[PDB]
From a paper:
Our data show that this locus orchestrates the degradation of 1,6-β-glucan, and this enables B. thetaiotaomicron to utilize this fungal polysaccharide. The critical enzyme encoded by the PUL is BT3312, an endo-1,6-β-glucanase that is displayed on the bacterial surface, allowing direct access to the intact glycan. The enzyme showed no activity on 1,3-β-glucan, 1,4-β-glucan, or 1,6-β-galactan but was active on the 1,6-β-glucan pustulan, producing a range of oligosaccharides in the initial phases of the degradative process. The crystal structure of the endo-1,6-β-glucanase shows that substrate recognition is mediated by shape complementarity of the substrate-binding cleft and the hooked U-shaped conformation of 1,6-β-glucan, rather than through extensive hydrogen-bonding interactions with the polysaccharide.
Thus, to explore the mechanism of catalysis and substrate binding of an endo-1,6-β-glucanase, the crystal structure of BT3312 was determined in complex with the ligand β-glucosyl-1,6-deoxynojirimycin (GlcDNJ). In the ligand complex, unambiguous electron density corresponding to GlcDNJ was evident. The structure of BT3312 bound to GlcDNJ reveals details of the active site and the distal substrate-binding subsites. The Glc at the −2 subsite adopts a relaxed chair (4C1) conformation, whereas DNJ bound in the −1 subsite, the active site, is distorted and adopts a 4E envelope conformation. Within the −1 subsite, the carboxylate of Glu339 and Nδ2 of Asn237 make polar contacts with O2. Binding of GlcDNJ in the active site is also mediated through apolar contacts between the sugar ring and Trp377, which provides the hydrophobic platform in the −1 subsite. The catalytic nucleophile, Glu339, is 3.2 Å from the anomeric carbon of DNJ and is thus in an appropriate position to mount a nucleophilic attack on the anomeric carbon. Glu238 is in an optimal position (3.4 Å) to donate a proton to the glycosidic oxygen appended to C1 and thus is able to function as the acid-base catalyst. The −2 subsite makes only apolar interactions with the Glc in GlcDNJ. Trp345 stacks against the pyranose ring, whereas the disulfide formed by Cys393 and Cys396 also makes apolar contacts with the −2 Glc.
Author numbering: 37 to 60, 69 to 494
């Protein structure tokens, strides 16, 4: 028909099911434009790659096509990877574990896992955006703290030695360049994953003052001098700033220093603490700066495998909730973990599930979890370059939505009906109209031509 539809229900009566209706209230107002959208997706971790590589090649490629193809799938369009290890790598490591930045090289995990998978994904989707972050700097760039500047031989904790700001900037540059030599353009970085976390299996503490100085004196100058167009997003942690008074408004503080801010596209957030309302505060205070949602997880702590508990809440808070608070993109954590929540690392998340889970006896049977749905419901109809546009018509209980216009002149609409009852909706673009009974506890995505 005229309007293409995707539906998933909490109960799995519909499972990204396809429908269509023809033309025959929520009214889209394309003259009222908000942010443009970069993409949506998941993390391609070492553990994700390991699981994918253990599948039969054709099954892996089918899954990757379904996930990442625009024409043959859901068109996931943003992925996140780690610079060096994360807690879903096959070891603790960095790309320069031997002291001296002259020792920089991509390691076995990149050569054997990350690069082969990303090359397969790029074969399917050559315009996919990649954002990266380190979980730790090389251990030898660490100090115990900024007031105790002695070495710290730890994959976790510590702060970046100010004497190594210039060499660590060089680290980022060599990494980006090595990926480029392999055929992969890095679209964006952050300076550190979750810089207020000292825990995990790999970490580095970095306050806003350190990040400001690192960006303005080393990372921003060096990336620009290398001719890289890679964007830099600040922060990359939770809405509450982990309840550390000094660290509140983390990116805002950095934006106030004009020398740092000139290198920053915006700020990145996760939702592991605090309330997504924070995104609105930051946008209002600095409308010139971008916002991107870069990590959330499902796991044993939030019944991650029970879609009846997760679909509605995750679509409301992670997907539509961030996009309606100015975020240009939404990226979840591990695309694929096995049914044992792995492979994982001692001290890292050992309670996490994947956006999908794969069975580790056959490496074939895959179960989609809430994260796969929330993203596919976005990426299936909202393509890169889409601009979020206003809606008018009546505020209804349990109903949330978002509307966009894609650069190909197609409108896209995504709607959550968090009510047991179906609801009859009617949708207008001003010239054309369509109606659809939206099932209870559903997400529905719609796309049609202007
Ligand atoms: O807070 C919920 C749980 O999060 C688990 O961490 C998951 C991911 N979160 C942030 C980090 O950037 C990732 O490396 C990490 O895998 C955490 O392990 C668990 O203790 C929490 O209960």
């Amino acid at each position: 028909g005229d309007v293409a539809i995707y539906t998933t229900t909490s109960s799995l009566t519909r499972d990204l099911t396809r429908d269509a209706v023809n033309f025959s209230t929520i009214t889209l107002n394309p003259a009222e434009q908000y942010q443009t959208m970069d993409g949506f997706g998941a993390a391609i971790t070492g553990s994700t790659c390991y699981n994918l590589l253990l599948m039969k090649p054709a099954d892996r490629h089918a899954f990757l096509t379904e996930t990442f193809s625009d024409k043959d799938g859901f068109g996931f369009s943003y992925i996140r990877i780690s610079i060096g290890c994360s807690d879903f790598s096959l070891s603790e490591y960095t790309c320069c574990d031997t002291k001296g930045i002259e020792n920089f090289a991509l390691q076995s995990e990149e050569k054997d896992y990350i690069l082969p998978i990303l090359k397969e994904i790029l074969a399917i989707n050559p315009s996919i955006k990649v954002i990266a972050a380190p979980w730790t700097c090389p251990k030898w760039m660490k100090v115990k703290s900024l007031t105790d500047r002695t070495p710290l031989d730890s994959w976790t904790n510590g702060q970046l030695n100010p004497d190594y700001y210039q060499d660590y900037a060089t680290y980022f540059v060599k990494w980006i360049q090595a990926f480029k030599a392999e055929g992969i353009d890095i679209y964006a970085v952050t300076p550190q994953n979750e810089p207020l976390n000292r825990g995990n299996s790999a970490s580095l503490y970095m306050e806003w003052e350190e990040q400001r100085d690192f960006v303005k004196t080393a990372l921003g100058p060096q990336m620009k001098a290398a001719g890289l167009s890679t964007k830099i997003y600040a922060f990359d942690h939770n809405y509450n700033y982990d309840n550390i008074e000094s660290q509140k408004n983390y990116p805002g503080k950095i934006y106030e220093d004009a020398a740092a801010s000139q290198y920053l596209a915006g700020a990145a957030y996760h939702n592991y603490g605090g309330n997504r309302e924070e995104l609105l505060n930051i946008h209002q205070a600095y409308p010139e700066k971008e916002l991107l949602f870069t990590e959330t997880s499902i796991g044993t702590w939030n019944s991650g495998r029970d879609l009846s508990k997760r679909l509605m809440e995750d679509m409301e808070e992670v997907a539509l909730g961030t996009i309606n608070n100015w975020c240009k993109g939404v990226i979840v954590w591990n695309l694929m973990l096995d049914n044992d929540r792995g492979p994982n690392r001692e001290g890292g998340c050992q309670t996490c599930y994947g956006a999908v889970d794969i069975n580790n006896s056959d490496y074939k049977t895959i179960i989609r979890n809430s994260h796969y749905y929330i993203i596919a419901h976005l990426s299936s109809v909202v393509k890169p370059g889409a601009v979020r546009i206003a809606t008018t018509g009546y505020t209804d209980n349990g109903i949330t939505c978002s509307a966009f216009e894609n650069t190909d002149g197609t409108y896209a609409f995504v709607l959550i009906n968090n009510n047991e009852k179906s609801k009859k909706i009617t949708v207008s673009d001003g010239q054309r109209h369509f109606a659809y009974d939206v099932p209870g506890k559903s997400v529905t995505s719609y796309r049609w031509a202007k």
